Amino acid sequence: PIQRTPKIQVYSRHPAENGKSNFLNCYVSGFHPSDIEVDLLKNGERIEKVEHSDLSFSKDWSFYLLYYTEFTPTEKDEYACRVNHVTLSQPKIVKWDRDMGGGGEHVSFHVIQIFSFVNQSWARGQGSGWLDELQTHGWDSESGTIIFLHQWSKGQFSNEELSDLELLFRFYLFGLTREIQDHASSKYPFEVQVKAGCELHSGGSPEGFFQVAFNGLDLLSFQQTTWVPSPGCGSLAQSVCHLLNHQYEGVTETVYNLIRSTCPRFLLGLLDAGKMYVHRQVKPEAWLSSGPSPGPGRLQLVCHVSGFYPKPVWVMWMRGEQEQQGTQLGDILPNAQGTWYLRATLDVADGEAAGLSCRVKHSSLEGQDIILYWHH
């Protein structure tokens, strides 16, 4: 409790051309609880070499996962994303289909924790590090060590400082668990989610946060130096804010230092070390495919823009210079190696399809847009 149903999006990283090698992405988001089963399928079989990000969540507090794998489109073969969840009567299988598109400021650094307590002596725990929507760290649960995903993931910190963080985290975890095992007594499962870290805004002003959700609900947050419960009431929230407020501070002194000070300095180190490796402005490539039929005598035009970085992008359906108002822009989804994916669709009558084109705007293009024309 309580329950959210997974949303599933499947998309390739390149145009689909039979025999030619490609990447199958599956993005699974909007779900609660965290317990889930995602497989990429080839011809009904589970593909055993896949990549997945660790479990993360949205501001909603609902979870999302990215999945991907190498694949080769063929006339013959068949690919899917199969998801099982407590909100699903049956595992949803959503095929990837060329012809349907395969249906379904500031920088930030945050540390993510998910704790799953089935009871007192049984509990999963997982945590990771995120630089904006790019995962940069993992946590080795069994040894209490940090997994550095990229060559630049130490991000201009020394080994000696990163050791201290590891140790720090270890104690802290011991803390949460003992603390959470007490508060003990028709039941019995619950979930806890912590999002701790910092935004850095243009001009250099940082903004820490350390916020908790209980069973997918806002529980409490750290707000410019005061732990603050979310409206309930709301007594677990007030009680725990109370413990953290006044039983122990010095932990909040630590936390304050961590999120206002350590965090942004780490974050900027990440940015500095990352620039070296990856990546400059990257041009998207684009392609057309139909999408699912909107009905008899009607077509769905899909326009895919993939592999562009940075994120800011403009995509629209056109007749000439006229924007077509029906255009629906999907969400901008992440690709395997960190670039972006977006698709725009348009539903149109059979005979009015000819002459419509997809226009794509991006920084990397030097003002020379990508134009693609629908043909029959």
Ligand X SMILES: CCCCCCC[C@H](C)CCC[C@H](C)CCC[C@H](C)CCC[C@H](C)CCC[C@H](C)CCCOP(=O)(O)O[C@@H]1O[C@H](CO)[C@@H](O)[C@H](O)[C@@H]1O
Ligand Y SMILES: *[C@@H]1O[C@H](CO)[C@@H](O)[C@H](O)[C@H]1NC(C)=O
Buried b (16+ CB within 10 A) or exposed e, 127-165: bbbbbebebbbbbeeeeeebeebbebbbbebeeeebeee
Binding ligand D12 (rule: CB under 6 A), the pick from 91, 175, 234, 312 is: 175
Interface with ligand D12, residue 344, by CB under 6 A: no
Q: Which does 197 bind (CB under 5 to 8 A by kind): ligand Y, ligand D12, ligand X, none?
A: ligand X
Binding mask 121-160 for ligand Y (x = CB under 6 A): xx--------------------------------------
End-to-end CA distance of the chain: 49
- Shortest Cβ 123–ligand Y spacing (Å): 9
- Shortest Cβ 268–ligand D12 spacing (Å): 25
Structure tokens at 251: 């932990």
Interface with ligand X, residue 172, by CB under 6 A: yes
- Shortest Cβ 121–ligand Y spacing (Å): 4
- Shortest Cβ 244–ligand D12 spacing (Å): 6
Closest by Cα among 45, 32, 356, 42 to 213: 32
Backbone φ and ψ of 301, nearest 5°:
-95, 130
Interface with ligand Y, residue 118, by CB under 6 A: yes
Residues 6+ apart with CB under 8 A from 103: 9, 10, 94, 95, 96, 97, 291, 292
**Among residue numbers 242 through 271, which ones bind ligand X (CB under 6 A)?**
251, 254-255, 258, 262-263, 266
C-alpha distances out from residue 181 to 81, 121, 175, 237, Å: 37, 8, 10, 16
Using the minimum distance from each CB to ligand D12, give the nearer residue, 175 or 292: 175
Spatial contact of 277 and 155, defined as CB atoms under 8 Å apart: no
**Three-state DSSP state, 172:** helix
Interface with ligand D12, residue 333, by CB under 6 A: no
Spatial contact of 94 and 106, defined as CB atoms under 8 Å apart: no
Binding ligand D12 (rule: CB under 6 A), the pick from 100, 147, 176, 278 is: 176
Prior bond to 188 cis, omega within 30?
Answer: yes
- Shortest Cβ 286–ligand D12 spacing (Å): 45
Binding ligand D12 (rule: CB under 6 A), the pick from 94, 240, 286, 342 is: 240
Q: Which does 119 bind (CB under 5 to 8 A by kind): ligand X, ligand D12, ligand Y, none?
A: ligand Y
**Among residue numbers 43 through 62, which ones bind ligand Y (CB under 6 A)?**
none
Using the minimum distance from each CB to ligand X, give the nearer residue, 110 or 362: 110
**Distance (Å, rounded) from C-alpha 130 to C-alpha 155?**
13
**Distance (Å, rounded) from C-alpha 28 to C-alpha 302?**
21
Catalog residues that contact ligand X under the rule CB under 6 A.
Answer: 109, 111, 113, 125-129, 137-139, 141, 146, 165, 168-169, 171-175, 196-197, 251, 254-255, 258, 262-263, 266
Catalog residues that contact ligand D12 under the rule CB under 6 A.
Answer: 172, 175-176, 179-180, 192, 212, 240, 244, 251
